[PDB]
Amino acid sequence: AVKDIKKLIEEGILDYEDLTENELRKLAKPDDNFYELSPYASDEKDLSLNETSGLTNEQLKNFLGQNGTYHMSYDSKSIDYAKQKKSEKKEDQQEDDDGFYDAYKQIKNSYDGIPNNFNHEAPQLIGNNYVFTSIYDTKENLIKFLKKNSEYDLYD
Amino acid sequence: AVKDIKKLIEEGILDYEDLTENELRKLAKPDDNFYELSPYASDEKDLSLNETSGLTNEQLKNFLGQNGTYHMSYDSKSIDYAKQKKSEKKEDQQEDDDGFYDAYKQIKNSYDGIPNNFNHEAPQLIGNNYVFTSIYDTKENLIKFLKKNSEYDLYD
């Protein structure tokens, strides 16, 4: 009151209401694990990128633009090809969890500004200020404080 | 002060600041391993050439030229075809290093004017003079000297 001091005491003693503008902005500043050099990211199934996607055909977009008595509104060539492959691979044993666990981890990270394999700190605009959140350091109590108190108030 | 004399003494005794114009240009001249005849280059995965590349379709370039409400900006026909091959080869055991380890070497050689499998000396324009750098003889201390001292100065 400095940055590592707040992570222990503000859970026990200090409320967020009695903190200055130079103290709130530095807790939203990135930590010392940021600016630490880290290579070798761990690859996983990217739910962001769609391998079954295709290109705008412009004759579908013309025919679907003229609204009326059409019965299917996409191409279905690449997404059936995709379904035939899953019928032919015989990969079941952990893929029964991969579609069913792993999105929750990456879907919640989409509400924090964090992409798929990003094990580091990513910002999130709350009001007029950015808050760098993590996979581990979610900083949820700062988010509840800055949304509720600084709705009609400004603390940089 | 000649060329092989500088590689031993200038690390120990001589600074680069006290060197004449006929001495700086000859240390940037290529060595005697240059003009030595060397066949049989060693092939590796060329990260320069993209096997997944294609041709300008000119109806995509027209449709992407008219900016607005399109959702994919490339062809993706070939690049799905390439990813399918890596799923079918079952080659993992060293390719887990080939995309990850072999590559940092060719990327750093791009900052020195050196292509992929080029085990010889390649130039690099610094100011108004060329400096022939190598895989092994990086000549980094000449590069730090010619950028800093000869920014507003000229030494051929």
Place this chain on the structure above:
Amino acid sequence: KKCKKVFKPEFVNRIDKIGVFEPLNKKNLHKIVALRFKKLEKRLEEKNIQVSVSEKAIDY
């Protein structure tokens, strides 16, 4: 997960404890390579050449 994949994961219920080895660090490689020179003198005391390893010989 690989124990779920190759093994049909009942082995996880069978095995008491799964250990994972870190790869060797250079601080490990100081003392670990030195242990072979202790057993080197057991087979070569007939030869009676006692090889001494300085710390300069370690990193080479």
